């Protein structure tokens, strides 16, 4: 293992003593090799207290805030609906924060786990070469007084003004001000997931079969709306270790409400469109109806989950029309009947502008409103048209159950529809 130590140093010979300068080789050819037997292992003995290994770093919050980079791991929370870096356990890539001109010391102390375990035993296996390591004999006692010290943290509880210190209120008590850190290992575990789950060996395999349509059982992922957050800017390796796949980026997961990048310039209704009457024929509704058509209503082989998922699906459409109603109601005060009316009866009565007034000359209906249900029945006549084709459902009571699904959702729909005019 001494030879395995020194072959690493033979690489450190060959990595550094490679381009001999013809002017200053007198130290570079001669002195640079002489320390590399034992004194280089004593050169790094004074070079332990200049680097630290951290699970959590502070510098991504602001790249100059001097803080306390830490290494501890969370406990189990207790409610298993949560998720943090306590789920990792063994796969911990603790990115060392420190000077770039000394990180080979951490590459040197990586030689504990390489092959043999030897992690917690920097206190034994001292003198000899093969089964021990021959970090040499008399100096195998004051080196371990130093080289263990990179594993522990520098002991100072400190923060900075640029470190996002947050109050948190207590049950019937004062405040703990919480300083959240940046979980580097939890981020780097997701880069190990997302680079694999997008494009790898098996990920490209199922993608190539899309043209082939030859389904061996293996799913492939797809992650829309990822966000790139960069750190360090023009200088990424001056902060925590940003690797060759995490090159100063964080893939961020989207957390967005469904009314994102919607139709901001709201297109009006009452035109020659044959669909846009009572349900909002939009690409967010057309993708929803085909789910009910192509399965879960036509392909029925169960009463537990099949009958269940038909119930909330029309409860979506009962409220999606209400979403469609209020967007058409809001930000359109100048709605009227005169542009393009051929079959749009009572659409002036239901999705009206309230105007804080009535506008009527040869008519009384505009002053008030009672039972706007015929457009809801036409919506209910659309819900019978919403399912495409199913001929084997009429003899079964499934369409009779679906008629009850049609009936129990209009009953909610009519009562909601009252107070816009009642």
């Amino acid at each position: 293992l001494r030879q395995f130590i020194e072959s690493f140093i033979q690489e450190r010979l060959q990595g550094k003593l490679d381009k001999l300068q013809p002017d200053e080789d007198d130290k570079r050819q001669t002195l640079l090799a002489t320390h590399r037997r034992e004194a280089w292992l004593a050169d790094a003995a004074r070079r332990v207290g200049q680097l630290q290994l951290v699970t959590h770093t502070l510098k991504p919050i602001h790249p100059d805030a001097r803080g306390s980079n830490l290494h501890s791991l969370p406990q189990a929370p207790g409610q298993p609906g949560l998720a943090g870096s306590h789920e990792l356990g063994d796969r911990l890539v603790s990115d060392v924060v420190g000077n770039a001109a000394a990180l080979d010391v951490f590459k040197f102390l990586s030689l504990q786990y390489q092959g043999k375990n030897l992690l917690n035993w920097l206190t034994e296996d001292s003198a000899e070469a093969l089964q021990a390591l021959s970090d040499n004999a008399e100096q195998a006692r004051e080196w371990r007084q130093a080289f263990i010290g990179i594993t522990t943290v520098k002991g100072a509880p400190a923060s900075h003004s640029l470190a996002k210190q947050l109050y948190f209120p207590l049950p019937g008590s004062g405040y703990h001000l919480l300083a959240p850190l940046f979980p580097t290992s939890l981020v780097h575990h997701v880069h190990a997931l997302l680079r694999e789950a997008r494009f790898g060996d098996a990920a490209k395999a199922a993608r190539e079969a899309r043209s082939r349509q030859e389904s061996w059982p293996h799913g492939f992922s797809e992650y829309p709306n990822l966000a790139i957050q960069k750190f360090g800017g023009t200088k990424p390796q001056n902060i925590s270790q940003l690797n060759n796949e995490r090159r100063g980026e964080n893939w961020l997961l989207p957390s967005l409400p469904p009314n994102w990048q919607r139709q901001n310039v709201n297109a009006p209704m009452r035109h020659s469109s044959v669909f846009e009457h009572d349900f909002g024929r939009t690409p967010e509704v057309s993708r929803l109806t085909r789910t009910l058509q192509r399965f879960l209503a036509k392909t029925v082989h169960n009463n537990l989950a099949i009958r269940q998922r038909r119930a909330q699906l029309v409860a979506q459409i009962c409220d999606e029309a209400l979403q469609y109603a209020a967007r058409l109601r809001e930000l359109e005060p100048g709605w009227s009947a005169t542009p393009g009316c051929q079959l749009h009866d009572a659409e002036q009565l239901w999705l009206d502008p309230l105007r804080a007034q009535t506008d009527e000359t040869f008519l009384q209906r505009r002053l008030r409103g009672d039972w706007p249900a015929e457009v809801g029945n036409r919506f209910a006549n659309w819900l019978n048209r919403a399912v495409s084709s199913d001929s084997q459902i009429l003899g079964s009571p499934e369409a009779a159950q679906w008629s009850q699904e049609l009936s129990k959702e209009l009953t909610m729909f009519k009562e909601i529809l009252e107070d816009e005019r009642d």
């Binding site: 790249p63 770039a100 001109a101 800017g233 023009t234 200088k235 001056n238 090159r247």
Partner: protein
């Protein structure tokens, strides 16, 4: 003391640094003093209390200079280190009056 010219321009990125030394630097500057000032600027930022500018040797100038070599950016070793020592020597005459 000493000021650059390709820097203090429009806001740069790492990919726009690498394309400069892949050329002969840029207009009004040179590929030595771009990678040299970058190696000095990356070294001078990492200090703890910034009262230790005298602790900046030649070795940590190289360690930041090799970051560009990891991603393209064929540089000159002897030129960029000498430029990085110019800004370092300029950053101590102001410290002593």
């Amino acid at each position: 003391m000493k000021v650059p010219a390709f820097f203090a321009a429009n806001i740069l990125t790492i990919e726009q640094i690498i394309e400069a030394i892949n050329n002969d630097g840029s207009a009004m500057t040179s590929a030595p003093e771009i990678a040299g000032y970058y190696a000095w600027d990356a070294a001078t930022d990492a200090l703890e209390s910034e009262n230790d500018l005298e602790q900046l040797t030649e070795d940590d100038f190289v360690a930041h200079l090799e970051v560009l070599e990891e991603r393209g950016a064929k540089i000159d070793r002897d030129a960029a280190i000498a430029v990085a020592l110019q800004f370092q020597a300029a950053a101590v005459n102001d410290l002593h009056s």
